[PDB]
Amino acid sequence: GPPPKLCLVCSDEASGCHYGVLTCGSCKVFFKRAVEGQHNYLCAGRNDCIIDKIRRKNCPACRYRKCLQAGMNLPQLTPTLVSLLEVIEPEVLYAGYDSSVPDSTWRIMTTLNMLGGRQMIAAVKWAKAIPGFRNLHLDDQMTLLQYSWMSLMAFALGWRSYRQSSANLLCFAPDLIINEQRMTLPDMYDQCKHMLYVSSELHRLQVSYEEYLCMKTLLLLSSVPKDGLKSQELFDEIRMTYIKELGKAIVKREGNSSQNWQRFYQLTKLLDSMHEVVENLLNYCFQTFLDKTMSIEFPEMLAEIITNQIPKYSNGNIKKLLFHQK
C-alpha cells in the first residue's frame, strides 16, 4: 500500500490536490472560508505559529498565512543569528505610572522619557550582545546608538503596540497605555500618530517575529556619519550579514521563489520609511527638549544623547542608508 500523502499546511493526511496545493479536507474548506468570509484574523503569538493536526484550530491568522505560503489560490540545535537576537531581546519594563492620579501631558511625557531612558540602557546591553557590534570601534558604537536610538525605540514600541493592542493603542508599558482619552490630550496626538504608523505598517504587513528581530538589528545599522565610520569596512560586512539574515527569515515565512522578493521589497521599503518616522519623531522631541516653557523631564542618559545630536542633524553630517531610492 502507498505511503500516505501529507497536507503541505497541517501535516495531516491529504485528501488530494486542492486549490493547486496537496491539502487535506479540513484545510481546503478553511481556505475557501477565509477568502470568501472576509476576516481580519489576528495572531495571539508572533505570526509564526506551528500549524499541525493538533494546532490547526489554534491560529487562523497563521493557518490562513500558511495556505498562501504553500501556494493556494482560486536537528535544529545549531544556533542561527536570529535565534541569538530572540534570546537577547530586552525585557518589558514598567513605566511606574500612578494610575490612581489624574492624567496630564506633563506627567505622561515625563514618565515616558524617564522610562525611555531605562529602555535605552537595555538597548545598549542589547547592542553589545549583537554578534560583531563590540568588534567595531568605541566611537562607532557610540555613534550608531546616538543616531539610531529613536529607530530602535519606535520600532520596538510599534511591535509591542501591534501585538498587545491589535495596533489600536500605543503600548509604552503594561501600566502606561496611551488610550483614545490620553491621545486627545494637549501636544499628544501628533507625536502618537507617528509611533502608530510603525504599528499600523507592521499590522498591514503581518511581520513575523524573526523578520522583526532582523529589521530591528538593521535599524541600529541604518544611520552613519556622512563621511563614514572609524571601522567602516567592518560596518559594511556586519550590515550585509543582517540583510542576508533578513532574507533567510523571509525564506521560511514565504516558502516561494517570487513571493520571497515581493516580501523583501515591502520589509526593506518599511525600513526606509523608518527614517522619515524618526525624522518627524526627533523634530518634536528636540523642539520639546529646547522648549523651556513646556519644561518636561528627560533623564540624565537621554538628555546627553539629545544635546549631542541636535547640531549633527542640522549639520547634514548624517548619511541615512536606503534600500530602494538610493
Binding site: 540602557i121 545598549v124 553589545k128 540624565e300 542618559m301
Partner: peptide
Amino acid sequence: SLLKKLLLAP
C-alpha cells in the same frame, strides 16, 4: 561620558 561608561563596563 555617561553613554561611554555604559559601553566600557562589562
